[PDB]
A and B are shown apart, each in its own frame.
Chain A
Amino acid sequence: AVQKVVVHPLVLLSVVDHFNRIGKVGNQKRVVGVLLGSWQKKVLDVSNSFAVPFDEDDKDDSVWFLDHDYLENMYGMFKKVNARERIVGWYHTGPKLHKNDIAINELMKRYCPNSVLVIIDVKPKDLGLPTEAYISVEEVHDDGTPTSKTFEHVTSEIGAEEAEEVGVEHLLRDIKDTTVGTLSQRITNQVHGLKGLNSKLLDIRSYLEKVATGKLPINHQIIYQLQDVFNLLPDVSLQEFVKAFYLKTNDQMVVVYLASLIRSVVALHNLINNKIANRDAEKKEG
């Protein structure tokens, strides 16, 4: 059971270039490569990657090629230049995963047993998702379902490292916004923080429309049982939470009589100091 993966920011980048290498002839719309990583704890780390010649045909949709021979020797070279690094899994792109991914994963679990795949989105780069990591489990299946492979979820993030954030800050130099700017910046944090509140809402909007309609089979295990836990706790009971709002008056009180008065009086000093310096330099000009 893997806790989470850590995206070193060289690997994604090194997927973008190889999608751009074949992209002059790119019509396969998918690039499989090998995900190198550093196994630390239950938490996982990723440091490097490389590619592999890959083909696939939708006709009979099981005809494909990793190259074991290319995977042995080139990883052997990265082992020689760096003994710290080993394989932890693989990756592909083209955000809709395809039916073959059971076959690639169950093949190369004989290189690392708890292997893990990461889907990146090279063309989608817009709203809320950097990557995603999948994992395989095989229990009986459930209380009452037929057995299968069933790609499961591992939560993901983007990590960093000292002496690579230097390459982050120096290569961008574009907008260079700090979190400070507490009037302008924090309000916009509340703005687009709420623009994802309806974005996750419109996603949970669309899911129960197409399962109440009844197209896809209802996941009786987690897909609403975790929502059954969810839908009881926006507590808004009034007549004691109404009495939260003299603390609102208390938070107001420091703003009103302290910050409006002193800011006005200090700028009033700048009037008399200027009106003296105006005319006493005017009467001494002649």
Chain B
Amino acid sequence: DKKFHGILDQGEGVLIIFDEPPVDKTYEAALETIQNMSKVVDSLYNKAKKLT
């Protein structure tokens, strides 16, 4: 339920506490431009198919 930052083990019966990087904002917005770049190339090939 994401109330906590941790993990458990059964081989040792052990609770472990860690942290995480919030710096995904570069790579998140990186591939969202590819979705914009996918739509323009689909539009250009449609324009190039319309006339040689």
Contacts and interface: CB of A to CB of B under 8 A. Distances in A.
A46 to B, nearest CB: 50
Contacts of B30: 253-254, 257-258
A272 interface: yes
Interface in B18-42: 26-27, 30, 33-34, 37, 40-41
B24 to A, nearest CB: 11
A78 B33 CA distance: 68
B8 interface: no
B47 interface: yes
B34 A265 contact: no
B37 A262 contact: yes
Nearest to B41: A265
Contacts of B41: 265
Interface in A76-122: none
Contacts of A258: 30, 33
Interface residues of A, number: 14
A181 to B, nearest CB: 28
Interface residues of B, number: 13
A254 B26 contact: yes
B44 A268 contact: yes
A276 interface: yes
B48 A272 contact: yes
B34 to A, nearest CB: 7
Contacts of A250: 26
B34 A257 contact: yes
Nearest to B45: A272
Contact of B44 (A253, A257, A272, A275): A272
A215 interface: no
Contacts of A253: 26-27, 30
Nearest to A271: B48
Interface string A229-271: 0000000000000000000001001100110011001001100
Given A257-B30, A257-B34, A265 B51 contact: no
Contact of A265 (B40, B47, B48, B52): B40
A261 B33 CA distance: 10
A250 B26 CA distance: 9
A272 B33 contact: no
A272 B37 contact: no
Interface of B: 26-27, 30, 33-34, 37, 40-41, 44, 47-48, 51-52
6 contacts: A253-B27, A265-B37, A265-B40, A272-B44, A272-B47, A275-B52
Give the top 6 A-B pairs by smallest Cβ distance, nearest first.
A272-B48, A261-B37, A272-B47, A276-B51, A265-B40, A258-B33
Given A250-B26, A257-B30, A261-B37, 6 more contacts: A253-B26, A253-B30, A261-B34, A262-B37, A265-B41, A276-B51
